[PDB]
Amino acid sequence: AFPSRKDASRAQRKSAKKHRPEIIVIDLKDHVLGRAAAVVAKQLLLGKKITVVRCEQLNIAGTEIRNKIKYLQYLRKRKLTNPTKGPFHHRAPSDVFVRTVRSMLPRYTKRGMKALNSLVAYEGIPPNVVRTGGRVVIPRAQRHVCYRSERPYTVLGNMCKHVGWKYSDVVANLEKARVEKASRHHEKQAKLREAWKAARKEALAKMPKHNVEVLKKFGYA
Amino acid sequence: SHCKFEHPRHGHLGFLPRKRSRQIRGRARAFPKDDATQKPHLTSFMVFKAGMTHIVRDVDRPGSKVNKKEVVEPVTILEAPPMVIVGIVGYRQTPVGLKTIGTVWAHHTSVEFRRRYYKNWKQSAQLAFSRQKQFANTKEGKVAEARTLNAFAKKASVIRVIAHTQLRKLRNHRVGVKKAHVQEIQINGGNVAAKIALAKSLLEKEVRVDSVFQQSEACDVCSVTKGHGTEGVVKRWGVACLPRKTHRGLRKVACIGAWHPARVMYTVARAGQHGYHHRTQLNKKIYQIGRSVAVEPNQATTTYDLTAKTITPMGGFVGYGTVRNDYVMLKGSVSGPRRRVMTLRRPMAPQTSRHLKEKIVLKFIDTSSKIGHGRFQTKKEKNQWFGPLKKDRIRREERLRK
RNA sequence: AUCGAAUCGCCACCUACAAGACUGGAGCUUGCUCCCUCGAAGGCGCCAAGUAUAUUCAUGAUCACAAGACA
RNA sequence: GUGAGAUUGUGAAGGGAUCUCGCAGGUAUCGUGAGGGAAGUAUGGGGUAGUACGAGAGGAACUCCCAUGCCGUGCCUCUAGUUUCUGGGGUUUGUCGAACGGCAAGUGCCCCGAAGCCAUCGCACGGUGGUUCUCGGCUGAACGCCUCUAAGCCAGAAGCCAAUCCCAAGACCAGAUGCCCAC
RNA sequence: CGACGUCGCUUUUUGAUCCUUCGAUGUCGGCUCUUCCUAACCUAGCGCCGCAGAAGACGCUAAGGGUUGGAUUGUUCACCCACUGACAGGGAACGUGAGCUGGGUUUAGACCGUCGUGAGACAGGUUGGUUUUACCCUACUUAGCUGGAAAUUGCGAGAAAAAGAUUAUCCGUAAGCGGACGUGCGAGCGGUGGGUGUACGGUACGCUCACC
RNA sequence: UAAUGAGAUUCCCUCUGUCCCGAGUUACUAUCUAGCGAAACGACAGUCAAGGGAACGGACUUGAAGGGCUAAGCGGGGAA
RNA sequence: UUAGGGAUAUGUGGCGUCAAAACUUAUGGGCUCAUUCUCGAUACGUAAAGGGUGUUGGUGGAUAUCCACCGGCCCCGAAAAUGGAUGACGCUUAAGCCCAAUUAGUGAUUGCCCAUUAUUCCUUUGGUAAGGGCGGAAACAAAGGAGAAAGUGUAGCCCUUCCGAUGUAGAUGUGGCCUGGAGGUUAGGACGAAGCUUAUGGCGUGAGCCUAAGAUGGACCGGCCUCUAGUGCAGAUCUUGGUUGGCGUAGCAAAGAUCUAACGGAGAUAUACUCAACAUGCAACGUUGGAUACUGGAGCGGGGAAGGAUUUCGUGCCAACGGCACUCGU
RNA sequence: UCGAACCACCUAGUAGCUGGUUCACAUCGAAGUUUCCCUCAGGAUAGCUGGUGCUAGUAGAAGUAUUGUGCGGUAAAGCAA
RNA sequence: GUUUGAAAAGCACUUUGGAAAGAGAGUGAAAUAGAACCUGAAGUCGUGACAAAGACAAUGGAAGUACCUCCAUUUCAACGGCCAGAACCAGCCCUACUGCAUUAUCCUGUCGGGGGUCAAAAUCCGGCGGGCAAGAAGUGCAAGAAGGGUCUUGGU
Ligand SMILES: NC[C@@H]1O[C@H](O[C@H]2[C@@H](O)[C@H](O[C@@H]3[C@@H](O)[C@H](N)C[C@H](N)[C@H]3O[C@H]3O[C@H](CO)[C@@H](O)[C@H](O)[C@H]3N)O[C@@H]2CO)[C@H](N)[C@@H](O)[C@@H]1O
Ligand SMILES: [Mg+2]
Ligand SMILES: [Mg+2]
Ligand SMILES: [Mg+2]
Ligand SMILES: [Mg+2]
Ligand SMILES: [Mg+2]
Ligand SMILES: [Mg+2]
Ligand SMILES: [Mg+2]
Ligand SMILES: [Mg+2]
Ligand SMILES: [Mg+2]
């Protein structure tokens, strides 16, 4: 959806500043598939705009062979009379998660359609999402607090590549190229991150001492 | 209750919907798999169907009952004027798909290329590719050409070029179209830097069919089936026709389903569009890449058959005319009528079976008439059966009278 | 240019990355001892460009969408 | 704000206010491919071999070739079928006076007949990867040895899922583009 | 393999019932056509044998694909002839009558046997015996037109995107580094203009108008 | 029991599109236009899977679909 | 267990999302792993015998290891015909099973979510209803106000108090509503009655009543008390009239067939510009000539009966009829 | 129009069977059981129900207990009675 | 029902059309009384202006809102019968602040007999010496005459 010339001339007649709505971006690496989906299904329906990222890293409890059979029992369903009117079986991890959110929404009203179009659900971290603020996480759904560590789990990107989803290797080369790029950016500014903290330790004793023992009472030294 | 006897069901159910093709031309929905160890080369070429004929060739097939014996095989003649490259597109991989990065153009496009942009060319301003032509050699536009050529080298995994059939060298009276047929041909071979250099070098230069295919190989033929209108269930699906004493009619399917599921299924055969469908038809063995009559006045002449004759039969290909250009000759049939543009694409099947590795030498090409029963192979043979006739002896009487 | 609107947190310090049977560093008695960065803060922002006798503010009259809104 | 209309229930020319929406797109081409469909399946011969095995009687199999049945998608060069090209001719009865040219008999009938359509009655084509079931295993404890299983691995069915194949953005494609307009 | 026992699955049989339909759900079998199921006949892998080989018994994963031509009979069934790799068993209102057929059941005619005093009777035999309507809604098959992301509206701003996101030329990589028309007159990259030959016919390449 | 029968049955010959296994042509329709112009039918209406229910739902429960409007068909449903 | 509404609190059932509540509570304990109808999971409510060296507890024997038994969860046993169901998604440091708590060895109560229930507060309505007031206390002009009826039932004589309230078939009550006419009374209407119309409000729990506006109507009629009856419609395969979707749809397909020019006729040769004509007046009618056919003498030939009774003939004429057409016509 | 024609009448034949039965609110509110019936799709009868009341408003009250005093042969027990 | 109207005064005439008719004029109080002509319903349909609106067939209930309204009623000045805010009465509904009893199978003290450990503290059992484990117990009963509600009632 690119903005039309009616939506572009009004941003020139009125001098519209570049606007971004308040969007919460969840990094879903190592999250329980249906515990993260239920937290998201409630926040979207409370009016939150939510971008969801890294859906190939979601976890489902159990052996990979177990969760792959449960998708193939789901793919067994189709309208026998006309399967073009049937259940449509989405294979992307980003589209498995949109379904699992949607089945927790009031899907057949307008309030539940205004909340399912508030979710975006990428997989990997796309270039428009990278530099738009720190990602958030759902700490009540993170597999290291929710799964017993001796039990097997199942990465959603691996369950979905064997039932369809022909873009597993494309995502794996777009995320290998990102972490190489984002670690080059982070060795940079290490003499900017150390520049400020050696200036925030130097700001002490260059500032008046009656504002330091109130800065040491509240533990902000 | 079960069906009392078993027959296999009628019609392949994977060629649904049996609706009219969206476009008249053959279009590859998939090119061969890119081997980056190869040399960069084109993968498809557009040819036009020009009747069909038969040949005679001896068979090298050890073990067979026809080993070192001559067969008669039917072949189809497909005229191939060279296609001119006008563009270079490049596609980048996304988790959605495969997105186009951009296209450079050739700086010089044909009249019949930019005729494809007009429903009415002669009654128009004809000013397409007119501001791109002048911006491409400005200072900023020579930058923007090299800007997107570099963006191919960064992001593209798939490099393709845009060709068009060049119909004015197709001097054909019955193919009535004057705007060119445009498709994209994928470069396969090498890395992306080696593909663009082959895509830059053959840009605004015509590519000829024998630079894409060899003489004794196979190919895929993407082509659109000959159309037959609305046909009933017996013609379309091939169902059995009912007994003669049936009321309201024979050429119907008797039961279109059970009481439950209380709906007609998509598997039940019904009436509707038959013909004009796109088909891909792999493993069409090629027998002769021909050469134009301006080069070769003796096209159908073999080592083993020294009759000096062209590929065009006596009285022309019926409904088509004369093959005036280069041509490919394939074993058997291709989907579509004469005059229809067809895409010869390199095979995706493994070309390792011993039927497909076989080198072909011919012994005879039938250049007899396709009107009536063919009897003479050349017009020199009809002037020796028939002597001087009546209309010849009065033309010889006007030539002595002067 | 209709258009008055609902929205009310900014950052070229977050916006890199794994881990939780560990993830500051080492010792060897392997569950204790020892080292400083002490292992429980991303920075800002919240009315003098910065903690110091500096200078507007009404009458918009006692709540009303904040009558403001480029941070 | 600027253009365009309307205020139609009781006569007429005037001109006030108010309401309705128009104020940016149109056209053309090349592609993407989610999702849905979905297909090829069997057989005999050759040799291997009168070999393995067996007292003898008897009697295999894989690689590898060669064909074929059923199915599928096409095709019309050949062969066959079809003729209202009533095409050329032949033939009967009536009829334009006779020949000529024909005509009538819902296309008189007979023979040959292009083109087009069409037949398993002709012809051509029908391809890849993985996952893991049964299962046989590998390391390996519980259980100081043993064990395919408990962790972990290997190999792997005509199944299953993709590739190819068919439809395809109501999958609302800031995919790419040609030319006009409008900002 | 398995008596005597025993525990059960199955609803392709039949019985039992009487819930629904008697201001009507067309009551058999063929024919046609599609799909489903597995309790697997053939085909793909297998384990195991009182498995030497050859044929085969039993079992497992598997319903993807295949599962015929006939004589008699109205037949489902049965029964033989023959081919085959094999001729598995069932479901879908005992699938399927505005799909057909009408052989058979299931009227009025008539004949026979047994019964009845008779009129007549007969889950007894025989013969002859109207099969009606789609142009509606949906489904399915093809064939057109056409809006819409607040799925018609809000002006309700989210790009699988660039990186000043604070001012602003590009190229190529981060440290570096290439050049960028100068001031109405000029110049430069250029779209179209005149005359004597080159590359795979006519388009390109040699030597007046816009923009910087 | 000869002759006779729009009577019922069986085999054989000839014969053939009854069939294998279908194809192709014709006239008239359908189809498109001009003129003319009905009826049957009609609670309201009309996408499905399962569940339950008067124990075979278009409406109820939970899911799965569904942008709007059309032309020609067609016989699975509307226990038409 | 049910008058019309609020507030609080519950019950049955719940608290991961749908979906209100543990923004997935505890600072509680154990048990459970299940690979193609996919472990399990809200009673009534619709798989067994048998087996397991899966795991977790018990019991009794014996020399850190064996032996016999018994229980919990899990697996095997466990095979059907549209794609399919703990209600869906899902859940496995449960969102599963069995116990247990209520903000947690902190110091004592009731974690919170949902009713036509409960408590309580208003309003209505009816009682086997229960009480009070009704001899106008005094006083009061305009330029503190009105009511007060000895009462079944009202716009209830006025107040206060208490309890009940759903309901088919059915009964009953109603100073309960509505329609035609009659006896009385009291009034409307040409300055507009009845009738009709409604984004015309008002008020009655309701049947209904009343006002307003008609750019509607054009001469009759309202209210109250009694009397009377052919007195109230949504359905009877209801009666009669009209209309409507289907629908410009199905169709108007036997009996071969018409073509041409000139006349006739309003039925044409029908055009806002800057246009030569085609591309902007089409189709259809009669008559005579000509061409082409047909019937084919058991005739779409020429006369009669029965039946019809002016259809015969000329002239005008085209509204309706001749299922298309008409300038023709029975 | 025929296994008893057509017309008018008797005749609006008769139906324990099917269908229909026109305003509102309020106060109360059931039965599918008994007995008899050529009765078993119907009735009459008692019951449940409404209306009217009457009679000296706690009386001759009770789908309940307690205490006293009677009745019983089902569950269990037994087969050694 | 012929009931047009009081009376035919039943539309002269003009110009479009072959005509049916149409557009004007005219009569009349009225022609939206124009000839089976008073009133002119419902259903159904056209048209102008608007309101919108995905596919949940429609209708329906409740509760708000957005826009409209030839409607009603009230109010306009040292005033309101409109909208808000706080205050204070009363009533009622919430929640703060706790006392009386009870401990004993218990608390503490040391000598044993038992344990484990490098040695010994503890768990554990037993003698008689003391006892109050003292917002001490999650054990029995609780009567402690308020800070917040009341668009959960009425009032000034
Ligand atoms: N348009 C809505 C419909 O109006 C109808 O009723 C409408 C009409 O019956 C009614 O009639 C109008 C009248 O309002 C108006 N003030 C005067 C006019 N004479 C009348 O109209 C009448 O006369 C003319 C010719 O005179 C006729 O063509 C018309 O059919 C007729 N209705 O106006 C009413 C609306 O105000 C229906 N009652 C109703 O179903 C629906 O609401
Ligand atoms: Mg064609
Ligand atoms: Mg697919
Ligand atoms: Mg006879
Ligand atoms: Mg109840
Ligand atoms: Mg009643
Ligand atoms: Mg009556
Ligand atoms: Mg016709
Ligand atoms: Mg004749
Ligand atoms: Mg007519």
Instruction: Provide, as residue numbers in chain B, all residues whose Cβ is less than 8 Å from the Cβ of A94.
Output: 95
Degrees (nearest 5) of the Cα angle A91, A97, A98? Answer: 95
Degrees (nearest 5) of the Cα angle B150, B155, B158? Answer: 100
Provide, in whole angstroms, the distance separating residue B366's CA from nucleotide E129's C1'.
68
Is strand I less than 7 A from the beta carbon of A144?
A: no
* DSSP, res B349: S
Beta bridge partners, B288, equal: B329
Q: Which nucleotide is nearest to A82 (CA to C1')?
A: E140
Query: Which of A54, A123, A170 should be substituted to probe chain B, the one whose Cβ sees the most B Cβ atoms within 10 Å?
Result: A170
Task: Inspect the interface and report whether the beta carbons of B265 and A124 lie closer than 8 Å.
Answer: no
Task: Inspect the interface and report whether the beta carbons of A123 and B266 lie closer than 8 Å.
Answer: no
Experimental determination approach used: cryo-EM
Provide, in whole angstroms, the distance separating residue A148's CA from nucleotide I116's C1'.
38
- Compute CA distances B263 → A81, B65, B98, B233, B258, whole Å: 7, 53, 39, 19, 8
Contact by Cβ (8 Å): B182, B224: no
* DSSP, res B151: H
Contact by Cβ (8 Å): B335, B228: no
Task: State in Å: Cα A102 to ligand 4 middle.
Answer: 86
Nucleotides of F under 7 A from a protein CB: 17-24, 47-49, 56, 58, 63-66, 72-78
SS3 (DSSP) at B116: coil
Degrees (nearest 5) of the Cα angle B302, B308, B311? Answer: 70
Closest listed residue to residue B240, CA positions, set B253, B231, B230 = B253
Query: Which of A52, A79, A81 should be substituted to probe chain B, the one whose Cβ sees the most B Cβ atoms within 10 Å?
Result: A81
Nucleotides of D under 7 A from a protein CB: 23-25, 28-40, 45, 65-67, 70-79, 113-118, 120, 123-128, 130-133, 151-152, 160-169, 171, 173-180, 182-183
What is the least distance, in Å, from the CA of B266 to any CA of chain A? 6
Listed in sequence order, the residues at least 6 apart from B38 whose beta carbon sits closer than 8 Å to its beta carbon are B188, B189, B190
Closest listed residue to residue B290, CA positions, set B304, B281, B301, B306 = B301
The rounded distance, in Å, linking the Cα atoms of B251 and B273 is 16
**Own/partner pairs for B174-177, CB < 8 Å, 24+ apart?**
B174/B319, B174/B320, B174/B321, B174/B339, B175/B48, B175/B339
Give the number of other CB atoms < 10 A from CB of residue B80. 27
Contact by Cβ (8 Å): A93, A56: yes
The rounded distance, in Å, linking the Cα atoms of B48 and B319 is 13
Nucleotides of I under 7 A from a protein CB: 54-55
Q: Are strands A23-27 and A49-53 parallel, antiparallel or unpaired?
A: parallel
Contact by Cβ (8 Å): B88, B152: yes
The rounded distance, in Å, linking the Cα atoms of B267 and B100 is 38
| Nearest CB to B263 within list A81, A124, A167 | A81
Query: What residue spans of B27-138 are helical by DSSP H?
Result: 131-135
Instruction: Provide, as residue numbers in chain A, all residues whose Cβ is less than 8 Å from the Cβ of B14.
Output: none
Breaks in chain B, after residue numbers (C to N greater than 2.5 Å) = none
Cβ-in-10-Å burial (0-12, 13-18, 19+) of B145 comes to: middle
Listed in sequence order, the residues at least 6 apart from A121 whose beta carbon sits closer than 8 Å to its beta carbon are A51, A52, A55, A94, A95, A97, A98, A101
Contact by Cβ (8 Å): B116, B142: no
Listed in sequence order, the residues at least 6 apart from B169 whose beta carbon sits closer than 8 Å to its beta carbon are B81, B82, B325
Listed in sequence order, the residues at least 6 apart from A43 whose beta carbon sits closer than 8 Å to its beta carbon are A24, A50
Cβ-in-10-Å burial (0-12, 13-18, 19+) of B267 comes to: middle
SS3 (DSSP) at B221: strand
SS3 (DSSP) at B193: helix
- Return the residue of A nearest to B262 by Cα: A81
How big, in percent rounded to 5, are the helix, strand and coil portions of chain B?
15, 25, 60
Closest listed residue to residue B343, CA positions, set B224, B170, B225, B221 = B221
| Nearest CB to B95 within list A80, A82, A123 | A123
Tokens of A216: 């040491």
Closest listed residue to residue B79, CA positions, set B165, B201, B153 = B165
The rounded distance, in Å, linking the Cα atoms of B155 and B157 is 7
What is the 3-class SS of chain A, one letter each residue? CCCCHHHHHHHHHCCCCCCCCCEEEEECCCCEHHHHHHHHHHHHHHCCEEEEECHHHCEEECCHHHHHHHHHHHHCCCCCCCHHHCCCCCCCHHHHHHHHHHCCCCCCCHHHHHHHCCECCCCCCCHHHHCCCCCECCCCCCCCCCCCCCCCEEEHHHHHHCCCCCCHHHHHHHHHHHHHHHHHHHHCCHHHHHHHHHHHCCCCCCCCHHHCCCCCCCCCC
Task: State in Å: Cα B333 to ligand 1 middle.
Answer: 75
Contact by Cβ (8 Å): B365, B53: yes
The rounded distance, in Å, linking the Cα atoms of A6 and B260 is 53
SS3 (DSSP) at B250: coil
- Return the residue of A nearest to B155 by Cα: A174
Beta bridge partners, B41, equal: B188
Residue recorded with tokens 């080198």:
B359
Annotate B122-138 with DSSP letters as a single string: TTS---TTSHHHHHTTS
- Check the CA dihedral A185-A187-A190-A193 and report its sign: positive
Contact by Cβ (8 Å): A155, A59: yes
Contact by Cβ (8 Å): B283, B356: yes
The rounded distance, in Å, linking the Cα atoms of B160 and B195 is 9
Q: Specify the resolution in Å.
A: 2.5
**What angle do the packed helices B192-201 and B139-155 form, to 10 degrees?**
140
Q: Which value, to the nearest 10 degrees, does the dihedral of the CA atoms of residues B137, B138, B144, B149 take?
A: 20
Is strand I less than 7 A from the beta carbon of A110?
A: yes
Listed in sequence order, the residues at least 6 apart from B7 whose beta carbon sits closer than 8 Å to its beta carbon are none
Task: Inspect the interface and report whether the beta carbons of B95 and A171 lie closer than 8 Å.
Answer: yes
Task: Inspect the interface and report whether the beta carbons of B95 and A83 lie closer than 8 Å.
Answer: no
* Residue B38 φ/ψ, nearest 5 degrees: -70, 180
Contact by Cβ (8 Å): B19, B273: yes
Task: Inspect the interface and report whether the beta carbons of B261 and A174 lie closer than 8 Å.
Answer: no
**Own/partner pairs for B167-174, CB < 8 Å, 24+ apart?**
B167/B81, B167/B112, B168/B112, B169/B81, B169/B82, B169/B325, B170/B48, B170/B79, B170/B81, B170/B324, B170/B325, B171/B324, B172/B48, B172/B79, B172/B320, B172/B321, B172/B324, B172/B339, B173/B321, B174/B319, B174/B320, B174/B321, B174/B339
Task: State the distance between the two ends of chain B, measured CA to CA, in whole angstroms.
Answer: 90
Tokens of B160: 């393709």
Task: Inspect the interface and report whether the beta carbons of B93 and A170 lie closer than 8 Å.
Answer: yes
Listed in sequence order, the residues at least 6 apart from A123 whose beta carbon sits closer than 8 Å to its beta carbon are A53, A54, A55, A56, A92, A93, A94, A157, A171, B95
Q: Strand ranges (DSSP E) for B80-233? A: 83-93, 98-105, 158-164, 182-186, 206-207, 218-224, 230-231
Tokens of A132: 């738009």
SS3 (DSSP) at B237: coil
The rounded distance, in Å, linking the Cα atoms of B367 and B57 is 15
Task: State the distance between the two ends of chain A, measured CA to CA, in whole angstroms.
Answer: 49
Contact by Cβ (8 Å): B370, B319: no
Degrees (nearest 5) of the Cα angle A138, A141, A144? Answer: 110
Beta bridge partners, B328, equal: B78, B289
The rounded distance, in Å, linking the Cα atoms of A48 and A119 is 9
SS3 (DSSP) at B245: coil
The rounded distance, in Å, linking the Cα atoms of A56 and A172 is 10
Closest listed residue to residue B367, CA positions, set B286, B294, B293, B295 = B293
